[PDB]
Amino acid sequence: LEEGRYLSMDDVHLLIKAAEAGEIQEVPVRSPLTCQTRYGVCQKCYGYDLSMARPVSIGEA
Amino acid sequence: QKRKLQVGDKLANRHGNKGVVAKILPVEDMPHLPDGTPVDVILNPLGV
Amino acid sequence: QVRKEKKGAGLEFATPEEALAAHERGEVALNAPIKVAGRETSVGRLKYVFANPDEALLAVAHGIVDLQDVVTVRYMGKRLETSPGRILFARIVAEAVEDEKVAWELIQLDVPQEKNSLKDLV
Amino acid sequence: YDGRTGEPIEGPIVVGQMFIMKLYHMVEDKMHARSTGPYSLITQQPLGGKAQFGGQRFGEMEVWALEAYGAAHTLQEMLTLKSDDIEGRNAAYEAII
Amino acid sequence: AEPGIDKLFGMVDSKYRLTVVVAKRAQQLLRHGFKNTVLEPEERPKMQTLEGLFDDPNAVTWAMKELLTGRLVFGENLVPEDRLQKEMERLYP
Amino acid sequence: AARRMLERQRDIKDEVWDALEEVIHGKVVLLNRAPTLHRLGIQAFQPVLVEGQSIQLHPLV
Amino acid sequence: KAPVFTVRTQGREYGEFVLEPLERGFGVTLGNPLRRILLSSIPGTAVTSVYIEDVLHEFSTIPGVKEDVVEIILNLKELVVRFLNPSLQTVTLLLKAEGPKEVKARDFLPVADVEIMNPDLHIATLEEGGRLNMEVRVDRGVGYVPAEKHGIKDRINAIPVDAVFSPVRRVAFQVEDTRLGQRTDLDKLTLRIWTDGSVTPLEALNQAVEILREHLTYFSNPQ
Amino acid sequence: LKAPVFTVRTQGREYGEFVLEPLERGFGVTLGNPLRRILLSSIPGTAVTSVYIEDVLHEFSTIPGVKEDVVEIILNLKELVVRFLNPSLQTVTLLLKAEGPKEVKARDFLPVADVEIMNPDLHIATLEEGGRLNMEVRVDRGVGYVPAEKHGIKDRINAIPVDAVFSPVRRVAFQVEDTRLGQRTDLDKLTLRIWTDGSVTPLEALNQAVEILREHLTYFSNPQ
Ligand SMILES: [Zn+2]
């Protein structure tokens, strides 16, 4: 699972399943709470979610 | 003037089942009893 | 959804060769119904054999079998034993969308549809 | 029986004579269809009352949602061309006609 | 839904990009006369009782259909600002 | 001219109607519930001539 | 052997017909198709508009008159008439009695051709010196028509009404088993119809069946 | 008013788009349901009656040198479509025998009189080295769908009655939507879509239908 990849629903499952085996408890991911962008945020820091399912379109309210 | 029930009309029962009036299908293609006499009003069971 | 009639008797076909016939004969009488607790399949899924999905409907809407009755029909390339109601749902979704392949590739024709079943489907 | 196709509906249908009734709330007190009409003698709002009617309010709530969508123009359109700035209003009427 | 809306979103780097692009070309289609199209030959939008939707149906309805084909090109700074309505009004009546 | 044509007519010309529909064509309007809390509190739809005095709305929305 | 079209007519109202034998459940492909039209295409008769002397609006009442406007007006559409020529597209009757008496539809002034199959219809009653005066407009259209859709103005202060044509009370079709033929998987369609009086079952029958035929031709010129 | 315009859009010889409108209130249905009833239950055509093979005994067995099961074959049969020339063919027997490695298509059958197999490239079965395969299927003319257990045609007592797949019409799906017309909008937009195996194009298909229908109405003459 390369860096920056936008984990989809499916991905999440493999995460849960893996965790069940006691392989991982944490998950390194970008989030608005660490965005450097002065006002507003970045696509990456934000994420997938949108009226769609793919990456959020730049400039979304 | 007269108030002849049309489309935006709403009516309920003494039991508290309120609901608007969608389409008003003509007696023609209206579910009928094996012996003529078609139905009058069609309520949806899901509201029971 | 499919319907589960009453088993006239432990219809054993997992071994009785004649069962395909005999156990089904009793069916011809008043013994085991159409959708009995079939061993590997109720008589229903055996008397009526359907090649192309279309074949199903025909007999269905003709008054022969219902939509919740277990029968047999071949699809993409396998003889699956299900019911009209199930098979239909297939042609439906596969129609609403061009690619029929992926269509039946992402559904569960072996479980009565319900909220979630659809939710995920969408 | 269906009546539409004549094919009766498989499965009896409980029937009887239920007692219903219409309520005070009719469709008369609701049927606002406006496009071009009067204006607020004080501010500048499309209020009717006489020959025409008055367009429902928009409220900040609806706007927000509108803001969410990102309909910058659709929104700006509602806050101006369809209200205050009377210039763009008529200017618009001309372009349309 | 709308015609190949998906194919559109895939051509743009941002959802909102599409909008601004569809709108800009939509206007240029009516203001600068309705003969700036690029798919006028065949498969051109049609009406009903009278397929007269071959001349003036709806702006955007055409705009998108134009993008349907990789005939046009877009970008941030493609052609000079002012040199826009100058090369357009002179090329089209 | 057209303004007076229908300034008041209990016999709205048959031509008028056909024209109206010919006006909208692609253009789409907007629908809004009274209590708007979410974005979808307003969605776009392609109107079409209908009977009755009430607005016909799709069940899915 | 060919499907025998029998008839068991019993008066002007009731009308039963039998059609057998019939193919694999065909009686149904006929019973409903026809039945439908039978109650939404058959042209009848009804009261279009009326004008009372001592009246301005339908929501009024006349002295010496028991039942109020709306009450009588309703008892009117309940009336049924019969024309005797394709020309009687528009006929208007008139009646006006006084003193204590039951206002029966029959009391009307006969108009040669057109006949009223609804004699006993109790329209209204007059106490003493009841100023009964009206103008009953009658037409022969089709189906139902809103009183506010046509707007009949026989007179300046006359109020229209609603269409009550379709001389069909109720229809039903029975797709019983077979009676003849070496095959038991046959049908015997039999429909029983009821008419207000205008046109007899037969009448109504032929008509519908014809409307059908004609429609079948529209499927000519392809595309 | 305006007489309904009957348009069409036939793609090949299986699909059939038909559009007939506008139509009065609730009439497209008064036309859709009836049609459909005959469009798939009265249409004449061809179908596989009963099949028979020497080495075969039960419908649930397996012939050596042949991967497809008894049912798989019989099923590949009902599918196959034929065509007769003159009405003097209420019954026609088709035979077929082949051995050794090779694909068994429907065109392998022995050419008979005024009969044609418009469905040649049909994969009926493939035999391997020493694949002893021979059979004699019977086919006649009927209507609609009739279960194998229904008619029960038994030439050889050990033969097997097969289901009826006459009416080359695969299926139909009418539609009665409301269209516009200036003054009124609660109109009718009846649209019938017909499918066929190829024996007959959707065009003809419907024709015979209406034709038969009309004729049936003619029986509304002589009273009693
Ligand atoms: Zn950021």
Side-chain angles (χ1 to χ4, degrees), chain A residues 35 37 41-42 45:
Chain A
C35 160
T37 302
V41 193
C42 162
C45 243

PDB file of all heavy atoms in Angstrom, chain A residues 35 37 41-42 45, ligand 1:
ATOM      1  N   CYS A  35      -2.418  20.243   8.439  1.00  0.00           N
ATOM      2  CA  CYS A  35      -2.247  20.927   7.171  1.00  0.00           C
ATOM      3  C   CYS A  35      -1.503  22.254   7.374  1.00  0.00           C
ATOM      4  O   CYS A  35      -1.857  23.057   8.246  1.00  0.00           O
ATOM      5  CB  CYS A  35      -3.612  21.161   6.516  1.00  0.00           C
ATOM      6  SG  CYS A  35      -3.660  22.471   5.259  1.00  0.00           S
ATOM      7  N   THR A  37      -1.050  24.552   4.841  1.00  0.00           N
ATOM      8  CA  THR A  37      -1.750  25.580   4.058  1.00  0.00           C
ATOM      9  C   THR A  37      -2.457  26.576   4.965  1.00  0.00           C
ATOM     10  O   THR A  37      -3.397  26.230   5.679  1.00  0.00           O
ATOM     11  CB  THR A  37      -2.800  24.962   3.100  1.00  0.00           C
ATOM     12  OG1 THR A  37      -2.155  24.038   2.207  1.00  0.00           O
ATOM     13  CG2 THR A  37      -3.464  26.062   2.267  1.00  0.00           C
ATOM     14  N   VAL A  41      -7.325  23.964   2.962  1.00  0.00           N
ATOM     15  CA  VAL A  41      -6.519  22.760   3.106  1.00  0.00           C
ATOM     16  C   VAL A  41      -6.210  22.166   1.748  1.00  0.00           C
ATOM     17  O   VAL A  41      -6.642  22.689   0.724  1.00  0.00           O
ATOM     18  CB  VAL A  41      -7.247  21.708   3.962  1.00  0.00           C
ATOM     19  CG1 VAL A  41      -6.291  20.608   4.380  1.00  0.00           C
ATOM     20  CG2 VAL A  41      -7.846  22.372   5.182  1.00  0.00           C
ATOM     21  N   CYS A  42      -5.445  21.075   1.759  1.00  0.00           N
ATOM     22  CA  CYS A  42      -5.016  20.364   0.556  1.00  0.00           C
ATOM     23  C   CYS A  42      -5.800  19.083   0.275  1.00  0.00           C
ATOM     24  O   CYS A  42      -6.353  18.485   1.193  1.00  0.00           O
ATOM     25  CB  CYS A  42      -3.536  20.011   0.651  1.00  0.00           C
ATOM     26  SG  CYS A  42      -3.075  18.708  -0.522  1.00  0.00           S
ATOM     27  N   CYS A  45      -4.309  16.233   2.395  1.00  0.00           N
ATOM     28  CA  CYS A  45      -4.636  16.331   3.800  1.00  0.00           C
ATOM     29  C   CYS A  45      -6.105  15.950   4.043  1.00  0.00           C
ATOM     30  O   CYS A  45      -6.454  15.371   5.077  1.00  0.00           O
ATOM     31  CB  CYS A  45      -4.373  17.744   4.299  1.00  0.00           C
ATOM     32  SG  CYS A  45      -3.092  17.884   5.577  1.00  0.00           S
TER      33      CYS A  45
HETATM   34 ZN    ZN I   1      -3.605  20.580   2.901  1.00  0.00          ZN
END
